[PDB]
């Protein structure tokens, strides 16, 4: 099957044999080759258009940096918590030798819930000015590993109403370990980070939106190419 025409024909054959998820009879027709078990539900596998412009990294805590293990930290941040789901990370590097990550979160449950609800409901062109203040919690040592291929890792999110599954690329993996600050460097530590950070929600500028659309034009040119 080294013929390019044969490969193209195989591609169109694979494209044409997609089973409609709403077709229950055809779904039950499909049988597992080994398990011999009928299919129950199906979901389409599609890429995500609005997230290709952004850069995504899989962030993990290694060892004792686990939030569940740190019981007082978990109790302070709430026993899924919206504070964890809306946390901020601020990488600051004084020099190549010394590096760490700054973690911020919303202590108040109501403010974090309002911010999370506002962030997860962005489908219109009206955003309220939510001046949310983030408080520093802890710092960790970081290491980074890069992926040679673009789509080495991908996270899958589901959508039951549309029977689809949206996947996003992963650029790299970030690992964090607990860092004990040296007592002789606390004077310089106090001058690096901040006790509070205020986040203001504003509508994106036209030029930045055009830049992001130009970046997305690589994936989807039908609905986003400039005219």
Partner 1 sequence: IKLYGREDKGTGRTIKATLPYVKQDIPIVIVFRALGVVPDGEILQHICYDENDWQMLEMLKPCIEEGFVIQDKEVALDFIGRRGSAALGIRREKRIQYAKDILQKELLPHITQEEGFETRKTFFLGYMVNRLLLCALERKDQDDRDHFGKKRLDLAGPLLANLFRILFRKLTREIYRYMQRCIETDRDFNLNLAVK
Partner 2 sequence: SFRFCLECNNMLYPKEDKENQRLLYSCRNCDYTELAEDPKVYRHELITNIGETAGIVDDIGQDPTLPRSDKECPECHSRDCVFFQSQQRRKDTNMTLFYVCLNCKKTFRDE
Partner 3 sequence: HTKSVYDNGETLDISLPIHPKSHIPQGKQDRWVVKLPDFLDINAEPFDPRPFEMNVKTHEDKNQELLDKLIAVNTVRWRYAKSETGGIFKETNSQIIQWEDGTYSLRVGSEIFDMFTTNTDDNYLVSEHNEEGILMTESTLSKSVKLVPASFQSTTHQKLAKALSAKQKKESYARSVVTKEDPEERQRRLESQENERYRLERRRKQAE
CA torsion 187→193→198→203, rounded to 10°? 150
| Residue 224 binds which entry of partner 1, partner 2, partner 3, none, CB below 5-8 Å type-dependent | none
Determine, following the binding rule CB under 8 A, whether residue 184 of this chain makes contact with partner 2.
no
CB of 128 to partner 1, least distance (A): 43
Restricted to residues 105-164, the positions that interact with partner 3 (CB under 8 A) are: 119-125, 127, 133, 136, 149, 151-162, 164
Q: Provide the 3-class DSSP secondary structure of residue 218.
A: coil
Read off φ and ψ for residue 85, nearest 5 degrees.
Answer: -75, -10
CB of 172 to partner 1, least distance (A): 13
Cβ contact 21:138 at 8 Å: no
Q: What is the DSSP letter of 179?
A: -
Which residue in 5, 36, 180, 198 binds partner 1 (CB under 8 A)? Answer: 180
CB of 73 to partner 3, least distance (A): 11
Determine, following the binding rule CB under 8 A, whether residue 179 of this chain makes contact with partner 2.
no
CB of 175 to partner 3, least distance (A): 11
Q: Which residues of 194-224 are buried (b: 16+ CB within 10 A; e: fewer)?
A: eeeeeeeeeeeeeeeeeebeeebbeeeeeee
Read off φ and ψ for residue 90, nearest 5 degrees.
Answer: -130, 95
- When the beta carbons of 110 and 182 are compared against partner 1, the nearer one is 182
Q: What's the distance, CA 80 to chain centroid? A: 16
Restricted to residues 174-213, the positions that interact with partner 3 (CB under 8 A) are: 174, 181, 186, 189-190, 193-205, 208-209, 212
Per CB under 8 A, residues contacting partner 2 are 63-64, 69-72, 178, 180
């Amino acid at each position: 099957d080294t013929n390019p025409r044969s490969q193209l024909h195989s591609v169109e054959r694979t494209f044409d044999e997609v089973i409609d998820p709403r077709n229950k009879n055809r779904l039950q027709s499909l049988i597992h080759p080994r398990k011999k078990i009928k299919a129950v539900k199906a979901w389409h596998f599609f890429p995500d258009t609005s997230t290709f412009d952004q850069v995504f990294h899989s962030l993990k805590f290694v060892g004792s940096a686990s939030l569940s293990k740190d019981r007082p930290l978990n109790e302070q941040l709430g026993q899924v918590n919206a504070s964890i789901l809306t946390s901020l990370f601020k990488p600051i590097e004084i020099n190549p030798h010394n590096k760490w990550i700054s973690l911020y979160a919303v202590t108040d449950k109501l403010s974090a819930e309002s911010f999370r609800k506002s962030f997860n409901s962005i489908k219109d062109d009206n955003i309220v000015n939510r001046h949310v203040i983030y408080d520093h919690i802890k710092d960790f040592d970081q290491m980074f590993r890069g992926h040679k291929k673009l789509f080495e890792d991908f996270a899958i999110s589901f959508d039951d109403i549309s029977d689809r599954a949206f996947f996003v690329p992963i650029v790299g993996r970030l690992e964090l370990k607990k860092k004990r600050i040296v007592p002789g460097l606390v004077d310089m530590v106090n001058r690096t980070n901040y006790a509070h950070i205020r986040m203001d929600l504003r509508n994106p500028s036209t030029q930045e939106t055009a830049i992001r659309d130009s970046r997305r034009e690589q994936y989807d040119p039908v609905n986003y190419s400039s005219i």
